[PDB]
Symmetry: C3
Amino acid sequence: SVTANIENVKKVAHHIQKLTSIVPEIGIICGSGLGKLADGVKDKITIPYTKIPNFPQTHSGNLIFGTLSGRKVVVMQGRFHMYEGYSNDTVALPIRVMKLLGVKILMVSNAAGGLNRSLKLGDFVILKDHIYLPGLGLNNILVGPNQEAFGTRFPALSNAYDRDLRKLAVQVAEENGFGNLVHQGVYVMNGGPCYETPAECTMLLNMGCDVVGMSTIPEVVIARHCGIQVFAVSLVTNISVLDVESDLKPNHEEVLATGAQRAELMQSWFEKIIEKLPKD
Amino acid sequence: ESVTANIENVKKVAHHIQKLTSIVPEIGIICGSGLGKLADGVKDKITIPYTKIPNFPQTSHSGNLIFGTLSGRKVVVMQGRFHMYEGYSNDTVALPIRVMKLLGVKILMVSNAAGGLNRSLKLGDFVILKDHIYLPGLGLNNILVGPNQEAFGTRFPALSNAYDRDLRKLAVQVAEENGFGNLVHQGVYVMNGGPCYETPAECTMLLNMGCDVVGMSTIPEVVIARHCGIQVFAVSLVTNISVLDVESDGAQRAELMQSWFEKIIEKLPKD
Amino acid sequence: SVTANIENVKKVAHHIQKLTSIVPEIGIICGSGLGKLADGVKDKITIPYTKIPNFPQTSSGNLIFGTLSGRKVVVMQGRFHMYEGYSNDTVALPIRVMKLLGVKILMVSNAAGGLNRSLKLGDFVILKDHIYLPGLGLNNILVGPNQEAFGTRFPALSNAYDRDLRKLAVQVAEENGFGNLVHQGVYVMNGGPCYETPAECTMLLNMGCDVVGMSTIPEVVIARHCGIQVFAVSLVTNISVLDVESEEVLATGAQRAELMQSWFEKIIEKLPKD
Ligand SMILES: CC[N+](C)(C)CCCS(=O)(=O)[O-]
Ligand SMILES: CC[N+](C)(C)CCCS(=O)(=O)[O-]
Ligand SMILES: CC[N+](C)(C)CCCS(=O)(=O)[O-]
């Protein structure tokens, strides 16, 4: 990976600006439930990661630029997960590129396990806060020399999950008849890639966590560090088992199935949030 | 560090071992510190020093693999382990377990020495692990971080019944019928990366997290074993009782644990 | 960049020993509140880190030798924080150099967020214990081959924060009229460099932590490993927010610097000579 410093981020951004004239104001990272969001983007240019020098590589992932709900967007189709062995610089560079391209708001989804006992499979949990277990343990994405062109050395994570975007998301769900599926909660990052043990889930629930997943927080930290507002949502793809005696367990195909089942609704929700954002 | 624990490299190591012994092990046993006696009962033994195995990790006496039978069943015993607090890599720790898989191991029995958090524990008690909290794993130091080796298992392994409940039940029964059931507990093991012992504040936090014992090993091996379908039984010997507040200031047990493991193996189901 | 082994640590200590004849008994690592401690030292011999070969670089840091309240000291001005990406050996080496130079007591300050709800901005929290979140998660400074020259493989952290040094520190504060600022508590390390979220702060408070910061514990572990007594104090530079819907740190340090400096000087004055 190339260092996600201003020099390298500029080179990548400048290369992208030759390929498209679209100045995105919203960046979207597609997780669970957002698998067909790129189809909804109109007047789009699709740039495979392979066509961007010094951009991380993960068919190839794509950067999609276009209009969604009357706004200019860049959609990241293809993520770089820490459990896959990717570096901090790999995860940070795409977010910092979004910043240089013009992104003001980052919207992201992911799949998570439901710790909170009131959660149902397929529920949406808007992140209102997080617990960054890797970050507390010296694997924070920002470890290393601070890049002052982007942000400060010790970023505050106050209002990390923009309260006004959260309020809007809830309002849109309620107005469109699926407010009953929507919660707000604390997301804890398990580095992964193992699912959480019953003892681990019990610990995490008692720490005050509502959902547990293996991603997202590193991007959120980079976004907040460089001043991008964040809206993040976990799709509850499994209900955490807290009891060792239980034979119930997380199953990959069912986790993927839940994402796919909820995709139309999740994308609709994101689209309807975007159309309500103030603009001009 | 060391060679990637992929199918090609693990196969190469396994094939080398299969030229040094004709014993196909069904059960793998990992001896913890002060617990080398678990190998002493091995009948018709064949000893392979780690130095004889190219690409197998090396200790820094030499470590050995011991093949033979215990209570009639074919076993491989690991004498010398690779601890994460020593600076060994994920691949180093993973490779021996994946080698055991290819050699034919279906059940892994692991022992370690641990600190007692649960206040009902006494020095010298055995705590069968029923579950774990992998603090390094939750914090982005999980042994499986990196490309998944699909030949061994799936990207996101579930850890349900990680400590096989039928093996736990059998182990408790064997202890009770041999008159040391009073020494045996079941509990949750939490891994401290180490190598520092836990401070009183750490011990209190860990106890309140729902942990019964704390140690510096084992979980990484358990994760790799479960990832590739090996059933796991694991037991901690309580060698220290954790102090919970700042204001406040073995040999026979190894032999007993040896006997216990032997008597468990005698009763293991056999297809 | 160099292993903190006996061979490398000795080379560094020997280089320092030809630049100064002062044999330090007390080492002091300046965090928040101790920025001006170097100015108060008498018979100063300032050695910049650039002038010590094999010594880690941060810039330009200084090792100041001299006397403080009649006792020989070495003051580290310029620390090596793990959130900056320094290696374990980088952080360990200066402490082990201190050991070889003659240091018996290490006094350290830092800036920390107040979790305990009774704390006020500018309070002093003497560390009596810690929770080393990085260490529990496989990022302990001692991971790797144990350097037997300095200590044992599995160091115990019983009495890590020497109880007699804590007693002395509280007594000095009480008799100089600022005992009302002094608390004793548990420090938890957040690797950093992000400040802790409300959910993180709530979790940490419920684990039994009184203050949270991003330093100190690694140095304390190396010091205890090699048998140096430790006194550590956090300056409360921020009050943790525990619920969502929610410069000041640098101002608190600069404001309380004089008092903390005075406190450290007066502690060194009352230390046992035998
Ligand atoms: C439940 C989702 N699993 C299978 C763990 C995939 C993790 C990818 S993530 O964290 O971006 O949703
Ligand atoms: C005295 C050794 N301690 C710290 C208990 C570590 C135990 C090593 S183990 O896990 O193989 O038993
Ligand atoms: C408040 C200052 N923080 C963020 C903890 C940075 C470290 C300062 S230090 O060295 O005094 O701990």
